[PDB]
Design an enzyme around this catalytic site. Structure first.
Site, PDB file in Angstrom:
ATOM      1  N   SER A   1       6.015  25.610  53.868  1.00  0.00           N
ATOM      2  CA  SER A   1       6.074  26.474  55.055  1.00  0.00           C
ATOM      3  C   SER A   1       4.716  27.012  55.471  1.00  0.00           C
ATOM      4  O   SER A   1       4.637  27.643  56.538  1.00  0.00           O
ATOM      5  CB  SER A   1       7.056  27.633  54.882  1.00  0.00           C
ATOM      6  OG  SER A   1       8.374  27.146  54.782  1.00  0.00           O
TER       7      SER A   1
ATOM      8  N   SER B   1       7.089  27.265  49.839  1.00  0.00           N
ATOM      9  CA  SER B   1       7.552  26.762  48.551  1.00  0.00           C
ATOM     10  C   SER B   1       8.438  25.556  48.768  1.00  0.00           C
ATOM     11  O   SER B   1       8.944  25.301  49.871  1.00  0.00           O
ATOM     12  CB  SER B   1       8.315  27.854  47.730  1.00  0.00           C
ATOM     13  OG  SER B   1       9.553  28.220  48.364  1.00  0.00           O
TER      14      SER B   1
END
Ligand SMILES: O=C(Nc1cccc(-c2nnn[nH]2)c1)c1cc(-n2cccn2)cc(C(F)(F)F)c1
Ligand SMILES: O=C(Nc1cccc(-c2nnn[nH]2)c1)c1cc(-n2cccn2)cc(C(F)(F)F)c1
Length: 263
Positions: free
Chosen positions: A45, A212
């Site tokens: 992200s 993540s």
């Protein structure tokens, strides 16, 4: 040459069992500290910054663009939609999608940003236009987070991401109001207190974007205003060989602490 900071980062990496990538730009003197700075890592992200920035650039020639509604249908929800699910069968503006993607890490919001740019390659095309030859976005959410070792898709290097984040937030890749908007959004992130921020003195101000994914991949990219000196840009990327590995935000904090102590 290997510096004392680089030896400390290598010790941290060895104790962690994974692979750590760091890039610091200290904008006071333009110097850089790198650890695995030219190796590729899955962005996860942290790529949402490039997508939001590409839409900010489009807004520079369309004053109403950030107010433009985008339909949120039930079929659009993916695997992490804390803001978008409130708007199903309704709309969100491109501003609202940008803020949701950046500050809440909403994956449906990210997908609407990617679609506004014409797909993952439209995000890569913006990265090239601002001088980043390394970034590549190949997939949408959620599969851009598979983070498979050796896979080039949806990766960049620490050196390239730090240079890009500097140009977007402190340099002139965006118009002045758009750069200020990106900085405001990053400073209002909700997800970052355990990552880079956790390794820095409390008086320093941070804006950041986390990421993540699989392989215990744990990432953060930040712009930092330390007390009494010019801003820093810091990228910390971390990925593990063990597929079901737990994420390790503390390793990012420890890398940031080492960097701060070396300044
Ligand atoms: O939501 C998340 N992850 C997610 C979402 C949906 C599916 C799966 C999944 N799919 N398959 N297995 N797990 C995983 C997620 C994770 C983290 N995080 C965990 C450790 C370090 N950071 C942080 C955040 C936040 F920053 F946004 F707050 C979101
Ligand atoms: O989508 C995801 N994760 C997510 C979603 C939203 C926000 C964040 C975040 N933001 N900041 N930090 N984390 C992270 C996610 C996660 C995983 N996974 C597998 C094991 C652990 N994880 C796998 C996949 C994929 F199989 F589809 F590829 C996607």
């Amino acid at each position: 040459q290997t510096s004392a900071v680089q030896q400390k980062l290598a010790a941290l990496e060895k104790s962690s069992g994974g692979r750590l990538g760091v890039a610091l730009i200290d904008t006071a003197d333009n110097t850089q500290v790198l650890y695995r700075g030219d190796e590729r890592f899955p962005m996860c992200s942290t790529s949402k910054v490039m997508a939001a920035a590409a839409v900010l650039k489009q807004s520079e020639t369309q004053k109403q663009l950030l107010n433009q509604p985008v339909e949120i249908k039930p079929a659009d929800l993916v695997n992490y939609n804390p803001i978008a699910e409130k708007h199903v069968n309704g709309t969100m503006t491109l501003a609202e999608l940008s803020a949701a993607a950046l500050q809440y890490s909403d994956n449906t919001a990210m997908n609407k940003l990617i679609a506004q740019l014409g797909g993952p390659g439209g995000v890569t095309a913006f990265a090239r236009a601002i001088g980043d030859e390394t970034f590549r976005l190949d997939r949408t959410e959620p599969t851009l987070n598979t983070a498979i070792p050796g896979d080039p898709r949806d990766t960049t290097t620490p050196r390239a991401m730090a240079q890009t984040l500097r140009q977007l937030t402190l340099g002139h890749a965006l118009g002045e109001t758009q750069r200020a908007q990106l900085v405001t959004w990053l400073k209002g992130n909700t997800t970052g207190a355990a990552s880079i921020r956790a390794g820095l003195p409390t008086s320093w101000t941070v804006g950041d974007k986390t990421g993540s994914g699989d392989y215990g991949t744990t990432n953060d990219i930040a712009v930092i205003w330390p007390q009494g000196r010019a801003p820093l840009v810091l990228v910390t990327y971390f990925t593990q060989p063990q597929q079901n590995a737990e994420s390790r935000r503390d390793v990012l904090a420890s890398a940031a602490r080492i960097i701060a102590e070396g300044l």
